[PDB]
Amino acid sequence: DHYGIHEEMLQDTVRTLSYRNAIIQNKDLFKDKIVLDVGCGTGILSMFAAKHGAHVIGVDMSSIIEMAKELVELNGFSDKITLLRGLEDVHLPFPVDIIISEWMGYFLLYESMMDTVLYARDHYLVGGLIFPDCSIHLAGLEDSQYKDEKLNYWQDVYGFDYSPFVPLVLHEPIVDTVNNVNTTSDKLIEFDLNTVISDLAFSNFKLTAKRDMINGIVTWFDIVFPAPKGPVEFSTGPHAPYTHWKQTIFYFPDDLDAETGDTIEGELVCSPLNIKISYKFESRKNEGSYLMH
Amino acid sequence: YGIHEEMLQDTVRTLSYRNAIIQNKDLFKDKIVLDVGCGTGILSMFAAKHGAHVIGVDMSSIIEMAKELVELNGFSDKITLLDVLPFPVDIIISEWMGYFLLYESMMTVLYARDHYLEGGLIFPDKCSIHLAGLEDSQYKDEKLNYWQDVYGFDYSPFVPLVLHEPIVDTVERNNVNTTSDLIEFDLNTVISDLAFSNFKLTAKRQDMINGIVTWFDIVFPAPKGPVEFSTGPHAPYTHWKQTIFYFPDDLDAETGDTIEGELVCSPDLNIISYKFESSEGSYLMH
After folding, report:
1. Residues of chain A with C-beta less than 8 angstroms from the C-beta of B156
2. Buried b / exposed e across B132-141, counting CB within 10 Å, b at 16+?
3. How many CA atoms lie within 13 A of A189 on its CB side?
4. What is the secondary structure of B169-201 as a DSSP string?
5. Contacts of range A231-235, beta carbons closer than 8 Å, 24 or more positions apart
6. Per-residue DSSP letters for B215-263?
7. Do B165 and A67 touch (CB under 8 A)?
8. How many interchain CB pairs under 8 A, A with B?
9. Please, are residues A56 and A46 in contact by the beta-carbon 8 Å criterion?
10. In this structure, which long-range contacts are made by residues A73-77, counting pairs with CB atoms below 8 Å and at least 24 apart in sequence?
11. By three-state DSSP, how is residue B98 classified?
12. Contact B161 A3 (CB under 8 A)
């Protein structure tokens, strides 16, 4: 029952309207069907499905289910929505056609519930649909003025040398909203939720300077929804409208004074999130270790 | 790393601990100090630098950097970092205060006092919780109106969730429109006392009163004949800010009007019955 987290998401109009417009686009396929809402939160996605032709089962392990039952009751969906607190533990009233789920995290796979979505697909899904059914992208960034201040602070802390703290600052990823992207973007990996857990621990990339100082990489993820034959999508990149996911910044140990045409080539390893990235800067070689805790 | 940077950049707090150690530098000489929740160990280094052996105890993986910093700053011979003591202590320094003073507080300090500390000193050794009233009619009205219509759906039942949640934020000084009045704590004599008050507030002008802003004051021990700091909206910024509790109704108050109340605090933190003469609120911190 932390209301800020539910507010943040509902106030993310890009996120919420994407799920709504995807349900409406496929409302013919929602008609007279059984929907499972993984991580229903307040139940907004469940109410969307039920009003547009769907029974919907919402499963969230938070105490917010008590509020969801009250909201579902107040808007006249009590006969079409059954909410259960607790997915590997709950017992569905039905042995499902459509899976709607809001599962994405900051780095897509940081605090994501995709493991639960794959579980729902493998155990409850009939050709069934999966809203949404995603890719991670990255590019170079200029953050020299902000980064230098954060690092300079530790040279003198009330007289004491706090220099060994600097490696901590370089290792922590930064979730923030990034004009300052000065390289081309590359695609790290694709995920098809219909066929993809072992695939999550996983890529090479190549970036070329478009003009600047390069101090790190900004990363985001794209989302695509299923659509009938002949799709609703949205991005969380610095070139797209704001989302509550923002972007994830990884700093370099060294600051590259690059000119146009220079290249940053690398290999990113992601494993349970431990992120090790080896770089090559051609105009040389460096690495970066980051931990999401 | 976020928290530790936030601690050190709170200059009001850190310099308060420093200046308190410096004021009592005569009593720190050649003595043993216990740093409860040493974090990065800056308070341990302060005691050691100004005449103290200091033992820092933190259950976080930070004790490792503390070591590296202590090693780098020449205190390896005076500071030992980290159920756990090399000594069977004269002074307890501790940074233990939380939001509302008690929420997630480390007031472990009483355990160190009762088990490891007679006539020893405790930095700081005195606390107080205060409160007054404020006008946040414009921001509060925004939050609660959002739920009347959420993508067509009636989200009315949610508002109480928003009116019950405490808000940790910095209140501007000009928005306090009543007088200030909750409890004292003496770290030398005070766990059962934490579950605990009556208060009375008078409107200092004609304005809207939408809730109470609460803060806490801190006092350090001093020799005969003390360093202190406040976290109120009238004092310089601290990383604690203030804690706001909303009223269900907004009082359109005139000068001289009174708000009498009783606040009950009991353990997570359950938190107030009001009377507004011109003649309730429950909060949970989780």
Report:
1. 74
2. bbbbbbeebe
3. 16
4. EPPPGGGB-B----EEEETTT--TTT---EEEE
5. A231/A22, A232/A18, A232/A21, A232/A22, A232/A25, A233/A18, A234/A14, A234/A15, A234/A18
6. EEEEE--------EEE-STTS---TT-EEEEEEEEEEEE-TT-EEEEE-
7. no
8. 68
9. yes
10. A74/B154, A74/B156, A74/B157, A75/A47, A75/B153, A75/B154, A77/A46, A77/A47, A77/A50, A77/A51
11. strand
12. yes
Amino acid found at B118: E
Rg (chain A; Cα; Å):
22
Task: Inform me whether the C-beta atom of residue A153 falls under 8 Å from chain B C-beta atoms.
Answer: yes
In one-letter notation, the amino acid at residue B45 is M
What is the SS3 assignment for A254? strand
* A171 closest CA partner among A274, A271, A251, A107: A251
Retrieve residue B197's tokens. Answer: 């008050």
Structural biology method used = X-ray
Give the ranges where chain B is alpha helix by DSSP (H).
2-9, 11-23, 25-28, 42-49, 63-72, 109-116, 137-145, 159-164
Q: Provide, for chain A, the percentages of residues in helix, strand and coil under a 3-state DSSP scheme, each rounded to the nearest 5.
A: 25, 35, 40
Query: Within the 167-226 window of chain B, which residues sit less than 8 Å (CB to CB) from chain A?
Result: none
Reference B70, options B20, B35, B98, B27; nearest CA is B35
Peptide bond into A95 cis (omega under 30): no
- Alpha-carbon span A10 to A16, nearest angstrom: 6
Distance between CA B142 and CA B150 in Å, rounded? Answer: 13
Q: Find chain B residues with C-beta within 8 A of A42's C-beta.
A: 155, 158
CA distance B141 to chain A (A): 15
CA atoms within 13 A on the CB side of B15: 10
**Facing residues of B169 across strands?**
B242
Q: List domains and CATH numbers for chain B.
A: 2-95 (3.40.50.150), 127-285 (2.70.160.11)
- Of B224, B250, B240, B237, nearest to B97 by C-alpha is B240
